[PDB]
Point group: C3
Chain length 302, copies 3
């Protein structure tokens, strides 16, 4: 019989603590879907559909071999059903059927995390593209039995493309636009659901000399990210989120409904900006994040 443990999940930029256990366990996770109106950009509002109050949903972290027990609830105020498809899960719809939950209801189901990796999870209620485009996606990290190398700083980042009826900048509550979605012409492309969610006062933080690891997901719906950090180079890249590691990469592809893990040492102070290098998305649509590094200057590097 398997041990029962409550999972530690985090709201985004934050990542749960590393797992210090060398045996399988039943990990209980609680998730709620809530529809709410939030700021997309200055003077722009959007009706997001979320996993636990924001975009992306809370990061889940378990160990290879663990059984993940999910208590899935859909808030009474929701207008449509919601569920969840874990790319980390093996079986019918990644758990979608088992978690189909009408508003004001609760569903429970479990699945075994048979393989390590960094997996996207997202709502799969029809129409699928709309539920995803409204913000229903997050990440679940399944650590290898032996764990991952220790690192000084960890960040949870998820890129998504959004389709607004009005063009980028149009004030007020902007409705989801089906036509632009099908045509794959988003108005906003962002990290963690909103323009500036990880920039300015919300910038990520690290200290010079610290090793950094970013768990980068791409919830889509449609765009593929040419992920890059201005002023830095990826020492390591877990290609497409898998076991294969590449090194000295400037820009990595993060598939739609996919992920990547990148690591780099920030040996010099300054502001590093995360971007989808399909450039106009970054400087015109909002795909821009910042990692502010405090510390002391080294002219030998620059």
């Amino acid at each position: 019989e398997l041990p029962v443990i409550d999972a530690v999940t985090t709201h985004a930029p934050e990542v749960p603590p590393a797992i210090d256990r060398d045996y399988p366990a039943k990990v209980r996770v609680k998730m709620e879907t809530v529809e709410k109106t939030m700021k997309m950009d200055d003077g722009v509002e959007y009706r997001y559909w979320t996993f636990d109050g924001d975009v992306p949903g809370r990061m889940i972290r378990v160990r290879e071999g663990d059984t993940v027990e999910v208590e899935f609830s859909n808030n009474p105020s929701s207008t449509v059903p919601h569920n969840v498809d874990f790319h980390a899960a093996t079986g019918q719809g990644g758990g979608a059927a088992a978690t189909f939950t009408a508003p004001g209801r609760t569903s429970t189901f479990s699945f075994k995390a048979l393989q390590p990796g960094l997996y996207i999870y997202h709502c799969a209620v029809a129409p699928v593209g709309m539920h995803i485009a409204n913000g229903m996606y997050g990440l679940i990290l399944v650590e290898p039995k032996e764990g991952l190398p220790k690192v000084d700083k960890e960040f949870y980042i998820v890129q998504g493309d959004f389709y607004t009826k009005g063009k980028k900048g149009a004030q007020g509550l902007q409705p989801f636009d089906m036509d632009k979605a099908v045509a794959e012409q988003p108005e906003y492309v962002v990290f963690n659901g909103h323009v500036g969610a990880l920039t300015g006062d919300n910038a990520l933080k690290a200290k010079a000399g610290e090793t950094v690891r970013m768990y980068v997901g791409n919830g889509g719906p449609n765009l593929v990210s040419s992920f890059h950090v201005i002023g830095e180079i990826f020492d390591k890249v877990y290609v497409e989120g898998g076991k294969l590691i590449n090194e000295n990469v400037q820009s990595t592809i993060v598939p739609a409904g996919g992920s990547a893990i990148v690591e780099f040492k920030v040996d010099i102070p300054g502001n590093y900006t995360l971007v989808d290098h399909s450039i106009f998305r970054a400087f015109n649509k909002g795909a821009l994040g910042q990692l502010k590094v405090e510390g002391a200057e080294n002219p030998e590097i620059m």
Copy 2:
């Protein structure tokens, strides 16, 4: 001179028998190009230009070092010249010049399969994009001298984007639309030339516990696939169809005019759906396939 062997090619979902020989051979392949009107979707017809009657063309399977002798016939009823560019072939146009065949003629030529891999082959008659967009592509698997591991189930899948003058859903015979193709705005994105070609009654089949390997090609012309199988995880991925193997990947990029090889064990019964995870293509344009798995339920997994 080498031992002669008549190639066994398969119409799509099916893959030819694995190669169990450790010596080079002259493999005789016969291909015919035929233009025909077929159903793209319910009430929607399209004039396809095909390699052997459907999209994709018949899968070819040879061994690294083999000499592939192609007898290329262009059906008498064709209205334009056709040829073939084998990405597996080294030399002028991948064989296109040597296989330029007018309607009612048969061209013969040969090429040595110098390197193992999973290669796209397609027509290259001007205008190249049009011949490809009308459905002229397939895959040729060149096995390594040592062969490939035995697997229980092998499937032949090729994604393609189609450009219809009318919008998706418009009834009747829909002509090829050059303007949409250049702008890279397809109306249909499908697996194996037709909406549902691999779904419903045409779903792929396997039994719980079987090892599965999918040879995934992307004939384009333009889209790049974020290939994924809902409810499953790729144990192995031959990155971009080459020698490099990744593991535990949820979604892999299949380059336009490229491929990928993914493997996974289907340990639990259910319906698994193949999709391009640039999501709207899958649930709005037709990039959706199904693998039905019969067998007995394991709750420990889900």
Copy 3:
């Protein structure tokens, strides 16, 4: 202190000589930004913004551990300031802040090439996407300490998407078009700044039997290249320009703001054309280059 060496930088198709030194050095590089009108296609002119007179800029080649000193000059006739972000550099904007140069001014700065790889460098003056779209980008190769394997032929290739107000073919001077850029709908997609820059009389050259290496960049701004050479197969691919080597690949993804290194032996005469296999870009938008190989025929290969 470090020996000072004037760098050899090459205008594109050409690559600087391999680095034959096993000790670090201070490599002096001179770069000038100049805005000039040039031919994009027959009867079509475009106002390019360039690093040293053309697109891409001159290729820089240094050794891991080298200190790169840059003397950056913005020509008096320029209408806006320019600078440079080296993806090879670690620190604030890859050197963008330190190289912000007004017209008629000169700036100097230096950085240590801490990691080997093939890096894109580009202007980063707001609006960033426009400075890149007008042609401001190039490559800097940072060799590994031990160097790279000897190869018979080396080529400098950089893809880029351009956005013109008029559609492809419209005669006269065509201004940059922001709306098409944001929507990611280029009119021209080319290798080395102009349609035909590497084709016809400008084709690359090699002899049968020679080993070839192409340093492939993708300055974007927005597209991702499914890079392929018709009639050839990539023996080796430095995945996304990093350390990881794939083999037997027909087509590789070159990320926006990213690169790749491909190698192949041209064992038979003929014309091999480089293309972005998102096919219409190649045959309709200009993403087409040629490598003409002289020598004698080998029927055994084809």
